[PDB]
Design a protein around this ligand. Structure first.
Ligand SMILES: [Cl-]
Ligand SMILES: [Cl-]
Ligand SMILES: [Cl-]
Ligand SMILES: [Cl-]
Ligand SMILES: [Cl-]
Ligand SMILES: [Cl-]
Ligand SMILES: [Cl-]
Ligand SMILES: [Cl-]
Ligand SMILES: [Cl-]
Ligand SMILES: [Cl-]
Ligand SMILES: [Cl-]
Ligand SMILES: [Cl-]
Ligand SMILES: [Cl-]
Ligand SMILES: [Cl-]
Ligand SMILES: [Co+2]
Ligand SMILES: [Co+2]
Ligand SMILES: [Co+2]
Ligand SMILES: [Co+2]
Ligand SMILES: [Co+2]
Ligand SMILES: [Co+2]
Ligand SMILES: [Co+2]
Ligand SMILES: [Co+2]
Ligand SMILES: [Co+2]
Ligand SMILES: [Co+2]
Ligand SMILES: [Co+2]
Ligand SMILES: [Co+2]
Ligand SMILES: [Co+2]
Ligand SMILES: [Co+2]
Ligand SMILES: [Co+2]
Ligand SMILES: [Co+2]
Ligand SMILES: [Co+2]
Ligand SMILES: [Co+2]
Ligand SMILES: [Co+2]
Ligand SMILES: [Mg+2]
Ligand SMILES: [Mg+2]
Ligand SMILES: [Mg+2]
Ligand SMILES: [Mg+2]
Ligand SMILES: [Mg+2]
Ligand SMILES: [Mg+2]
Ligand SMILES: [Mg+2]
Ligand SMILES: [Mg+2]
Ligand SMILES: [Mg+2]
Ligand SMILES: [Mg+2]
Ligand SMILES: [Mg+2]
Ligand SMILES: [Mg+2]
Ligand SMILES: [Mg+2]
Ligand SMILES: [Mg+2]
Ligand SMILES: [Mg+2]
Ligand SMILES: [Mg+2]
Ligand SMILES: [Mg+2]
Ligand SMILES: [Mg+2]
Ligand SMILES: [Mg+2]
Ligand SMILES: [Mg+2]
Lengths: 173, 173, 173, 173
């Protein structure tokens, strides 16, 4: 084993690699959303830029797992980054609904990793998850839920004026 | 009696303690409104922050009565702060209507205290009320009434787009 | 359930609401202490301002629980804020002794909530408690204990000169 | 009558002149206290300077009544400024006790003038009293009472060390 490795279970190492792939998957889905909202026949630029920012964030989340793996003496093992589930995202409401589920999927995986870390008596990995990931997920989920609420209030999906207003007044940088 | 006490009727002292409790009650009701508008299924953040600010104001109003009581040689006597009348506040219109009635209840109590102070020939307490409270109440009542007018114009309670517009254009910090 | 809610047990949600009430209760007790030490026949202003500051802190602690509840998709439910146990607080020693017990009551409730969160496998709530509350409690308890030690050294309750010296040299802003 | 005079009763004009004399009397008493505490066999300089400051304040209070009288079209009529009741003031406690009674005498006279003004339906004179005098009296009375409390706590009159400590830690500029 690595000279640095101490109290780091094989199962946690593998789970970190799986998590990294999921972060990368989330990044790629948000890129798809960005591109959709930048289409000339969609054209909700502030929405698009929100998704772009989230794509970037998720990619940083992935980088931080790679660094974590090496710090603990584990070995980064990459897998294919699967393409997003959809090619087209309907409208701002549908996209936000998809983003909420994505975030909850990410969160569940983080929570599962934390439970594994707990089981294996790995306080360092717990702390990393709690300090760098779990609160950010709560924040994202809350923000997106709040957006959904507003989109529904604004009459989505039918009310185009409402969709326009949201893009112009909600999606603050 | 206190060495400082001069021209301060027992009835005014007691009425000051009652008023203090009412200020605290008002603060707590506005906190409830804040929390309601911060819910993920409500999500009107600027509305929420308006109520939060008013909660803070009312708590300062209470502190100022405590200081006043001691300055005059009276004794602060606290009672339970009753929970707000509702757990849920419907929508921005219903909440603003409740806030208007709350402010008018506060104002009536202030006016009643002023009449007591007058009756007891206490110019100092009159002046305090006039200089620190009565004008602020008029301002609040006016602001909230103006909001109600606008909320009705915007189609509340039914018109969700109108509610959204209000949150984004009216509730200035 | 709320669209945001994920891994948040009903029991934890209720316990958060109870905790919030206790923070508010602590705030109100410290306000009472402030008012007592501001009395003309007590007149220990720096002591009074220490308690005032703690009142404000506790109220901020309460606000942070309200925000936490909403972030997790729970629902804030308020109860009456009970009046403090005493109307009068004796002297600086008695008050500090009461404040120590108050802080320990708060701490015990936080520790109990953490144990519940642990039992329910809620790392997010653990982290919140550990990062925002538990260390602050240790600090407060230590500070107040240190004050008690000094008050006893200074001859409280009998030694008025000692009480005066404490107010003028210990209770630093 | 003066060309400016409007709604100004002869009784109020005379009462203003009496009040002015009382302000001047208060000033002169505080000067006496200053001189006593500056004696080489008393030597409590910070105490002395507190009284000096109050002497100056009272003299400004008198000036403001003179200006008020002329503004309303009354005529300033001066009387002798009587010497203070004592030549010697004992100690810091005795002096503060005398200052408390002096302030309460001043306050009573102000309150009496306000009642006269009320009776004569003179809102301008009411307002002047409330805005320029009555709150300052409450503040002074409170401050001095607080000092008395502390002086008693410190063991006055017998405890010279306590008197010294008060001069060095209480009588802030
Ligand atoms: Cl290992
Ligand atoms: Cl598709
Ligand atoms: Cl985080
Ligand atoms: Cl706009
Ligand atoms: Cl009285
Ligand atoms: Cl309700
Ligand atoms: Cl006002
Ligand atoms: Cl849940
Ligand atoms: Cl009691
Ligand atoms: Cl902490
Ligand atoms: Cl010192
Ligand atoms: Cl006239
Ligand atoms: Cl004499
Ligand atoms: Cl004044
Ligand atoms: Co752009
Ligand atoms: Co992520
Ligand atoms: Co990067
Ligand atoms: Co983020
Ligand atoms: Co905000
Ligand atoms: Co108020
Ligand atoms: Co405050
Ligand atoms: Co008046
Ligand atoms: Co205001
Ligand atoms: Co202060
Ligand atoms: Co607290
Ligand atoms: Co606050
Ligand atoms: Co931690
Ligand atoms: Co603290
Ligand atoms: Co000097
Ligand atoms: Co004066
Ligand atoms: Co001058
Ligand atoms: Co006035
Ligand atoms: Co003054
Ligand atoms: Mg090797
Ligand atoms: Mg392995
Ligand atoms: Mg933009
Ligand atoms: Mg495929
Ligand atoms: Mg954190
Ligand atoms: Mg007494
Ligand atoms: Mg009474
Ligand atoms: Mg805002
Ligand atoms: Mg009840
Ligand atoms: Mg005014
Ligand atoms: Mg729902
Ligand atoms: Mg439940
Ligand atoms: Mg201080
Ligand atoms: Mg009770
Ligand atoms: Mg910490
Ligand atoms: Mg003429
Ligand atoms: Mg005349
Ligand atoms: Mg000095
Ligand atoms: Mg004579
Ligand atoms: Mg004033």
């Amino acid at each position: 084993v690595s000279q640095v490795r101490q109290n780091y279970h094989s199962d946690c190492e593998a789970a970190v690699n799986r998590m990294l792939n999921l972060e990368l998957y989330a990044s790629y889905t948000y890129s798809s959303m960005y591109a959709f909202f930048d289409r000339d026949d969609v054209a909700l630029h502030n929405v698009a830029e929100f998704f772009k920012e989230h794509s970037h964030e998720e990619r940083e989340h992935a980088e931080k797992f790679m660094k974590y793996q090496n710090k603990r003496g584990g070995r980064v093992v990459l897998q294919d980054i699967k393409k997003p589930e959809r090619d087209e995202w309907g409208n701002t409401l549908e996209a936000m609904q998809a983003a909420l589920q994505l975030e909850k999927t990410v969160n569940q995986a983080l929570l599962d990793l934390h439970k594994l870390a707990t089981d294996k008596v790995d306080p360092h990995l717990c702390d990393f998850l709690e300090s760098e990931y779990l609160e950010e997920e709560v924040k994202h989920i809350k923000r997106i839920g709040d957006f959904i609420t507003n989109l529904k209030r604004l009459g989505l999906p039918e009310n185009g004026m409402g969709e326009y207003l949201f893009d112009k007044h909600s999606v603050k940088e």
